[PDB]
Amino acid sequence: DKLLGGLLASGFDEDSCLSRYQSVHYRKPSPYKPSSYLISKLRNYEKLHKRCGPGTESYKKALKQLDQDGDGECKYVVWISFSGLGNRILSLASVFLYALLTDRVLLVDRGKDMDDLFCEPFLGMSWLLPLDFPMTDQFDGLNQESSRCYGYMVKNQVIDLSHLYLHLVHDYGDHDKMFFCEGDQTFIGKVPWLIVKTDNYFVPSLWLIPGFDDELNKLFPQKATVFHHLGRYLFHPTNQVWGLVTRYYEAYLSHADEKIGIQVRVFDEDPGPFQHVMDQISSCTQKEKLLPEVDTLVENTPKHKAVLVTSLNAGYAENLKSMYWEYPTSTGEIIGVHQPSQEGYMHNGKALAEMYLLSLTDNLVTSAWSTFGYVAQGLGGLKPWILYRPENRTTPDPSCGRAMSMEPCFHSPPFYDCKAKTGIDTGTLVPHVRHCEDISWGLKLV
Ligand SMILES: OC[C@H]1O[C@@H](O[C@H]2[C@@H](OC[C@H]3O[C@@H](O[C@H]4[C@H](O)[C@@H](O)[C@H](O)O[C@@H]4CO)[C@H](O)[C@@H](O)[C@@H]3O[C@@H]3O[C@H](CO[C@H]4OC[C@@H](O)[C@H](O)[C@H]4O)[C@@H](O[C@@H]4O[C@H](CO[C@H]5OC[C@@H](O)[C@H](O)[C@H]5O)[C@@H](O)[C@H](O)[C@H]4O)[C@H](O)[C@H]3O)OC[C@@H](O)[C@@H]2O)[C@H](O)[C@@H](O)[C@H]1O
Ligand SMILES: [Cl-]
Ligand SMILES: [Cl-]
Ligand SMILES: [Cl-]
Ligand SMILES: [Cl-]
Ligand SMILES: [Cl-]
Ligand SMILES: [Cl-]
Ligand SMILES: [Cl-]
Ligand SMILES: [Cl-]
Ligand SMILES: [K+]
Ligand SMILES: [K+]
């Protein structure tokens, strides 16, 4: 089923984006079926996008509100291309959900590479913000003190509204965080143009806004499927990225009975590679029976496992590779350890290819705090084993634990009760919104 259970629309040109419908020759079918209401919601999104999108007569009329109000036919939310690729992917998926919940059209700031990495997701009509949008060269300078920043208008009690800037970056404050309150969403609902900048996956705090909560439950009744569905919908790699994927997979990974992904990210100043991290990896994989122990004893048909290791430093894959070369397995399993080329013969090209290759594995080990890992697990429908974040170059004990769900984590959530107007722990409100495994103050859907 190339349409992923109805998540994807038919009718796209096959050759101009091979990944779109070929992803099925490489992936097991997801066990999570998109709800019929999410399927309607996306097919209706496409209708709206086609009516209101870039370059249409409607879009051109709405652009004049920026020089005025207005009272128009089409409203928008523009995603600003900000931060690293994994932050971008998650944040964009979040802004897309927000569009869905508010009957807005999503426009994407293409930044330096978005059109080079991704195909168009909306049948008929591009998702890219036009390059001559007049506010574009203000995007980097938009901040908490910008006149039309929502938080600035809140704290100053500004009275007038064609557009608003929503500062949702990790450094945001109390006023900016009022985005996550119902009364503020009523106000913001009236503004035809929203401009968002964020480096977080802010999905889970949408679930705690009245009104959004009812709609979200209809769309995603199993709760922890938001990124799995919206990520698969939105993001299809371009043919040159997908070539990197298919060629790697077919050469190195395709013969194995089971594929293990290991996504290594080490948040440290010094270059590496670190023994305590090597030790963490071997212990994790071996205590969870993802990879077999080796032994030095002198003294029944063999599975073949392929281990895909992604990392900035090649030492982690080398260490594992060498271990399984130099010693027999205690189980008799055949282990091959593989890592993609570090040196080129599209920096982001290879990075995206690697996230996709991880998503094609059977069991995935991720690194704590890594949005790169979140993207991979989400696209693959993998509930990972998470390598906990080390402190002071000491192997954590336990080394890893299974995640609660495949969802990504919101790293910098608000902690505010909008009704009582005071701080609250927003990870103890509803059972499906919990604190993350890897980052104790973050939130995730479970
Ligand atoms: O949403 C966060 C968002 O951040 C993006 O990255 C941006 C962010 O970087 C922060 C992290 O920097 C790392 O260092 C980088 C460095 O930026 C680069 O220059 C360098 O080349 O690479 C380095 C990595 O190799 C540090 O390793 C991190 O520590 C830092 O994360 C922040 O960590 C502190 C806590 O630090 C302690 O944790 C253990 C240990 O690792 C560290 O040394 C300790 O000191 C957090 O502060 C705590 O925050 C909590 C929660 O409060 C927040 O969230 C809830 C909201 O309501 C609050 O308003 C909000 O403040 C608070 O309760 C505690 O009191 C605080 O101590 C920070 O929250 C962590 O962010 O900023 C710089 C920018 O350059 C980066 O791009 C990242 O890419 C995104 O995925 C996402 O994580
Ligand atoms: Cl419509
Ligand atoms: Cl990244
Ligand atoms: Cl395309
Ligand atoms: Cl400023
Ligand atoms: Cl409110
Ligand atoms: Cl669902
Ligand atoms: Cl790293
Ligand atoms: Cl899994
Ligand atoms: K493209
Ligand atoms: K998979």
Task: Return phi, psi of residue 381, to 5°.
Answer: 60, 35
Query: ∠ at Cα 280 (278, 284), nearest 5°?
Result: 125
CB of 267 closer than 6 angstroms to any ligand 1 atom: yes
CA of 392 to the centre of ligand 9 (A): 30
The strand order across the sheet containing 193-197 reads 105-108, 76-79, 193-197, 163-167
Q: Within 13 Å, how many C-alpha atoms sit on residue 65's CB side?
A: 22
CB of 415 closer than 6 angstroms to any ligand 1 atom: yes
Range(s) of the domain holding residue 322: 1-446
Alpha helices in 113-238 (DSSP H): 114-117, 150-155, 182-189, 203-206, 212-219, 226-234
Going by C-alpha positions, the residue among 174, 136, 179 that lies closest to residue 155 is: 174
Contact criterion met (CB below 8 Å) for 179 and 150: yes
11, two tokens:
């009718």
**Between helices 347-359 and 85-102, what is the axis angle to 10°?**
70
DSSP letter (8 states) at residue 384: P
CB of 199 closer than 6 angstroms to any ligand 1 atom: yes
Q: Name the residues around ion ligand 4, CB cutoff 5 A.
A: 17, 119-120
What CA–CA distance (Å, rounded) separates 343 from 428?
A: 46
Task: Looking at the CA of residue 84, tell me the nearest atom of ligand 1.
Answer: 79
Contact criterion met (CB below 8 Å) for 9 and 234: no
Which ligand has the minimum distance to the alpha carbon of residue 91? 1
CB of 37 closer than 6 angstroms to any ligand 1 atom: no
Contact criterion met (CB below 8 Å) for 167 and 142: yes
Which ligand has the minimum distance to the alpha carbon of residue 103? 2
3-state secondary structure of 135: coil
Contact criterion met (CB below 8 Å) for 433 and 217: no
For residue 7, the tally of other CB atoms under 10 A from its CB is 19
CA distances from 86 to 61, 91, 326, 363, 373 (A): 34, 9, 35, 20, 8
What CA–CA distance (Å, rounded) separates 121 from 236?
A: 8
CA of 168 to the centre of ligand 6 (A): 18
- The resolution, in angstroms to one decimal, equals 1.8
Contact criterion met (CB below 8 Å) for 60 and 136: no
How many domains does the chain divide into? 1
